[PDB]
Amino acid sequence: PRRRVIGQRKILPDPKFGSELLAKFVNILMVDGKKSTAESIVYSALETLAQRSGKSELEAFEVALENVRPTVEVKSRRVGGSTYQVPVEVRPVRRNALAMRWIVEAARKRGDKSMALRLANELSDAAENKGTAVKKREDVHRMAEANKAFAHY
Amino acid sequence: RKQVSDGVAHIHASFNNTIVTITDRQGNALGWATAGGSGFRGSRKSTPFAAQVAAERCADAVKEYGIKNLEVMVKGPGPGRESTIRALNAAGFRITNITDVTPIPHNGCRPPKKRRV
Amino acid sequence: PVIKVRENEPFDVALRRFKRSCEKAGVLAEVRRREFYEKPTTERKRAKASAVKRHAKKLARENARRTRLY
Amino acid sequence: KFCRFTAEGVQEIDYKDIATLKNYITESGKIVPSRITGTRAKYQRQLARAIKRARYLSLLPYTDRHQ
RNA sequence: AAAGGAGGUAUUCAUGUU
RNA sequence: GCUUGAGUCUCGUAGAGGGGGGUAGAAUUCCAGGUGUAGCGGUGAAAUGCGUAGAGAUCUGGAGGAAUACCGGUGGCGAAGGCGGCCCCCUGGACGAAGACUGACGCUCAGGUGCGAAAGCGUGGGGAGCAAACAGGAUUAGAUACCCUGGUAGUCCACGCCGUAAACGAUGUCGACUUGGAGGUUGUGCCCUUGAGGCGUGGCUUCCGGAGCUAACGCGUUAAGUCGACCGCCUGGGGAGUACGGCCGCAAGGUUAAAACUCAAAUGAAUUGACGGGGGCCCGCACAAGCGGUGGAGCAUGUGGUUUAAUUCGAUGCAACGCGA
Ligand SMILES: [Mg+2]
Ligand SMILES: [Mg+2]
Ligand SMILES: [Mg+2]
Ligand SMILES: [Mg+2]
Ligand SMILES: [Mg+2]
Ligand SMILES: [Mg+2]
Ligand SMILES: [Mg+2]
Ligand SMILES: [Mg+2]
Ligand SMILES: [Mg+2]
Ligand SMILES: [Mg+2]
Ligand SMILES: [Mg+2]
Ligand SMILES: [Mg+2]
Ligand SMILES: [Mg+2]
Ligand SMILES: [Mg+2]
Ligand SMILES: [Mg+2]
Ligand SMILES: [Mg+2]
Ligand SMILES: [Mg+2]
Ligand SMILES: [Mg+2]
Ligand SMILES: [Mg+2]
Ligand SMILES: [Mg+2]
Ligand SMILES: [Mg+2]
C-alpha cells in the first residue's frame, strides 16, 4: 500500500504436528475453501513420504522444502525510462511461501492419479533434487545469473 | 612463454566497450581481451560486469607467461573503470600501481557537434 | 592521479584511495564536459545564469534565516 | 583565509622560488583555485603567471602524466 | 552517474609525518 | 579679466586593449616501425564503415595544422564589435597622489569620414580536427530531418570587397542634484601594522532596497527619480522594410523608401482558471505481490446489424449493452 503497515493476522498451528509452516502449506493447497479435504490430502502425503524417505513426516517435509527454497528472484525495476530485469535477494518469510507454492503447483501438474500420491511423489522428487519444483528454482537461479550484470542497481 | 613476472594492464574503457591489454613493462603486448569477444553485445557489452569478465578472460590468456606483479593504467571514461581492477585482484596478481592516463587536451582539436536527441 | 600501493596496504583501501584521488582531480567531469563542444554563447549563458541562481539561493538562506518556522 | 603574501608585504612573486609554487600547485600539477587557497586576486594572477613561467623553464612539471 | 544523511555557505585551522 | 568646466606636465598603478615576431606542452590525425590477434566502431536497438594485405589496443620515432585545460572569477580591458598559454618589439587608453601650469580652449552633431561578430565573395596559400552540400545505413505511414558512418566548400593565413545581427542593458551623448545596505576590483592617506588589523578618501563594477516614477512589470545615486543642451526616431494591424527610382557593391545584396487594397482589431503588462511528453508533495485494488476469473466451447440474456407487414419506443465512452422491463 501507500500508508498502511497492518499487523500480521492470527494463524492457527496445525492440529497434528503444530506447524505454522504446515498450516500455510494446507492453506496454499486448499481450493474453494475445502479445508477438510486439503488437510486430509496433506496428512496422507506426509505419512507416505515419512514411510518412504525417512523417520518423521515433518523431517521429510522440511528437507524437501529446504531443497526447493530459492536464494534469489528477479524483479522489474523502472528507473532509466526502460525496465531493468534485476536479481534481488528474497526475504526469509517469502522463501518458504514461494517454495510451497511451487511444490503445490508442480504436484497439481503431475500425472499420478491420487492427489496425495502426486504430492508424495513431488515431495520425494524435491528431496532427491530431481523434481519439477527444484527445476523451476534452478531456472530462476539461472536467470538471476544471466542478469547478474545489474547486481548493484 | 618468457616469464617476466610483472606486467602493465592498459584498461581502455570507453562508454561503448572496454579493452584490457596485458603488456610487458617496455610496451610489447602479451595478451588482450574485450567484452565483444566475451560475447556481450550492445547494452550488455557496455556494462561493468562485462568489463570484469573481459579482465578475467585476459588474465587467463596471459596465464602462460606467468606474470605475478601488475601495474594498472586505466584510460578513458568507461562504465566499469574499476570492475576490471577488482577482477584482476581476484585473478591474483599483486597490484603495484594504479595510474590514470586519460588523455585530456589543453584545448586542442574541436570536438564533434552536440547531439540533438 | 597516480597511486602506488603502500606497504602493507589492503587492496580495497588502495582502490578507495584511488577513486578519491580521481574525484579530487575531477577527471570524469573534465572528459564528460569535453565530449561535445558547447558554443561560446552557450557556455557563457549556462554558467552566468547558474552563478546568479547560486547567488539568489545564498540571499534566500541569509534572509529566510530570520523567520518563525512555527 | 589568511592571505600569506600580504602578511609579509611581499612585493612580487618570484618564479625562481620553487617551494612556494609547489605549495600552490596540486599533486597533479594544476594551479590551486584562489577560493581554496585564500590568496588575494592580484597575487593570484601574479602567482599564475609565475607558475606558467616555471613550467616553461621546466622547474615545475606540466601535468602528473607521462611527463 | 543516481539515492539517503550530516556540516558549511568554509574557510586560517602548528608543522611534521604522510 | 578670473579659475571651479576643459586640457598639459611630474611620479606611480592594474589590465585577455591593439599590431608584429618567436616559442612550449598536452591532445587529435597521418606516416614508418616493434609487440600482438580477431574484432573494432556505433546506437534506444542495429546496419552502413573499418580489420587476417593484420585492424582496434600498446610502445618508439617522425610530419603537420589548429587551439591554448588548470588559473577563471556575475574578475579585467576596450567607443562598440570583441579580447585568454609564455616571451620580446612597437603602441593606444584609464586611474590615483601631490603640486605647477593655460585661462572657457566647452557639450552635442544633420551631411561626411572611420571602425564594425558570423556567414559570404575575389586572388593566392594552407588544410590536423570539425563540418553546410552530397553519399550511404537507419527511423517512420512518409523522413528531402532529428540518429549513425563518411565527407567537399568553409573554418586558418596574406591582401582586397561586403557591411548586416536578439550588433541587447531591447535603456542616444553630456552635465547638475536626491535617503541607504551588502559585496567585488583597483588606487591611496592616517591610526600603535599592538600579527593576518582600525579609521578615511578616490575610480570602475554586481545585488537588495526607500522616497519618487511607471499601465503594470520594475527602475531605483551606474534611474526608467528632478532638471538643463543637442541629436535620431514613432504616429493602427497587415500589404512591407516589399515595389519603383537613386546611391554603393565583382556578386550575393545593402541603404533610402511608398501606394493601391484589406481588417476592426493587432498589441503590452498583469489576474482567475485549464493544460504541459515542467517541478515538488500526498492518496485511491491505480500499479506491484497474490487468488480467482473473462477473451476459446455449449447454453441464458441484452445490444448492433440484417430481415420483415411489424420485428413498438427509449438508454448507447467511462457514466448504454441480465438497462427502463
Ligand atoms: Mg559521438
Ligand atoms: Mg569570417
Ligand atoms: Mg575565401
Ligand atoms: Mg581558394
Ligand atoms: Mg552528421
Ligand atoms: Mg539593423
Ligand atoms: Mg546581452
Ligand atoms: Mg536598437
Ligand atoms: Mg533595486
Ligand atoms: Mg529592400
Ligand atoms: Mg534585411
Ligand atoms: Mg532598389
Ligand atoms: Mg479499500
Ligand atoms: Mg496486478
Ligand atoms: Mg468470440
Ligand atoms: Mg464465451
Ligand atoms: Mg434450457
Ligand atoms: Mg420518443
Ligand atoms: Mg431497440
Ligand atoms: Mg431509437
Ligand atoms: Mg447489473
mmCIF file of N, CA, C and O (backbone and C1' of nucleotides) and ligand atoms in Angstrom, chain B residues 112-113 115, chain C residues 35-36, chain F residues 42-43 147-149, ligand 1:
data_model
loop_
_atom_site.group_PDB
_atom_site.id
_atom_site.type_symbol
_atom_site.label_atom_id
_atom_site.label_comp_id
_atom_site.label_asym_id
_atom_site.label_seq_id
_atom_site.Cartn_x
_atom_site.Cartn_y
_atom_site.Cartn_z
ATOM 1 N N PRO B 112 33.297 16.885 -31.848
ATOM 2 C CA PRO B 112 32.134 16.859 -32.741
ATOM 3 C C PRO B 112 30.940 17.552 -32.103
ATOM 4 O O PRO B 112 30.900 17.816 -30.901
ATOM 5 N N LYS B 113 29.951 17.848 -32.942
ATOM 6 C CA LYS B 113 28.835 18.680 -32.523
ATOM 7 C C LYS B 113 27.937 17.940 -31.537
ATOM 8 O O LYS B 113 27.905 16.710 -31.478
ATOM 9 N N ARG B 115 24.761 16.330 -29.720
ATOM 10 C CA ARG B 115 23.667 15.516 -30.229
ATOM 11 C C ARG B 115 22.320 16.121 -29.857
ATOM 12 O O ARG B 115 22.104 16.538 -28.717
ATOM 13 N N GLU C 35 33.355 16.115 -23.975
ATOM 14 C CA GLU C 35 32.955 15.214 -25.050
ATOM 15 C C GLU C 35 32.362 15.973 -26.232
ATOM 16 O O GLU C 35 32.660 15.657 -27.390
ATOM 17 N N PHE C 36 31.529 16.978 -25.970
ATOM 18 C CA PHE C 36 30.849 17.725 -27.023
ATOM 19 C C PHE C 36 31.085 19.215 -26.842
ATOM 20 O O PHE C 36 30.915 19.746 -25.742
ATOM 21 P P G F 42 32.529 4.589 -30.757
ATOM 22 O "O5'" G F 42 31.010 4.739 -31.194
ATOM 23 C "C5'" G F 42 30.667 5.409 -32.394
ATOM 24 C "C4'" G F 42 29.313 4.976 -32.889
ATOM 25 C "C3'" G F 42 28.266 4.754 -31.816
ATOM 26 O "O3'" G F 42 27.678 5.967 -31.389
ATOM 27 C "C1'" G F 42 28.242 2.942 -33.320
ATOM 28 P P U F 43 27.112 6.120 -29.897
ATOM 29 O "O5'" U F 43 25.604 5.632 -30.026
ATOM 30 C "C5'" U F 43 24.784 6.112 -31.079
ATOM 31 C "C4'" U F 43 23.530 5.292 -31.213
ATOM 32 C "C3'" U F 43 22.850 4.929 -29.908
ATOM 33 O "O3'" U F 43 22.043 5.980 -29.415
ATOM 34 C "C1'" U F 43 23.023 3.007 -31.269
ATOM 35 P P C F 147 21.130 14.658 -34.729
ATOM 36 O "O5'" C F 147 20.962 13.082 -34.626
ATOM 37 C "C5'" C F 147 20.562 12.481 -33.407
ATOM 38 C "C4'" C F 147 20.695 10.983 -33.463
ATOM 39 C "C3'" C F 147 21.972 10.462 -34.096
ATOM 40 O "O3'" C F 147 23.067 10.457 -33.198
ATOM 41 C "C1'" C F 147 20.124 9.315 -35.006
ATOM 42 P P C F 148 24.551 10.761 -33.728
ATOM 43 O "O5'" C F 148 24.902 9.502 -34.634
ATOM 44 C "C5'" C F 148 25.019 8.211 -34.058
ATOM 45 C "C4'" C F 148 25.364 7.169 -35.090
ATOM 46 C "C3'" C F 148 26.551 7.479 -35.981
ATOM 47 O "O3'" C F 148 27.795 7.222 -35.357
ATOM 48 C "C1'" C F 148 24.764 6.675 -37.296
ATOM 49 P P U F 149 29.107 8.015 -35.830
ATOM 50 O "O5'" U F 149 29.482 7.334 -37.215
ATOM 51 C "C5'" U F 149 29.861 5.969 -37.273
ATOM 52 C "C4'" U F 149 30.163 5.565 -38.690
ATOM 53 C "C3'" U F 149 31.138 6.465 -39.423
ATOM 54 O "O3'" U F 149 32.490 6.190 -39.107
ATOM 55 C "C1'" U F 149 29.266 6.048 -40.799
HETATM 56 MG MG MG G 1 29.528 10.649 -30.600
#
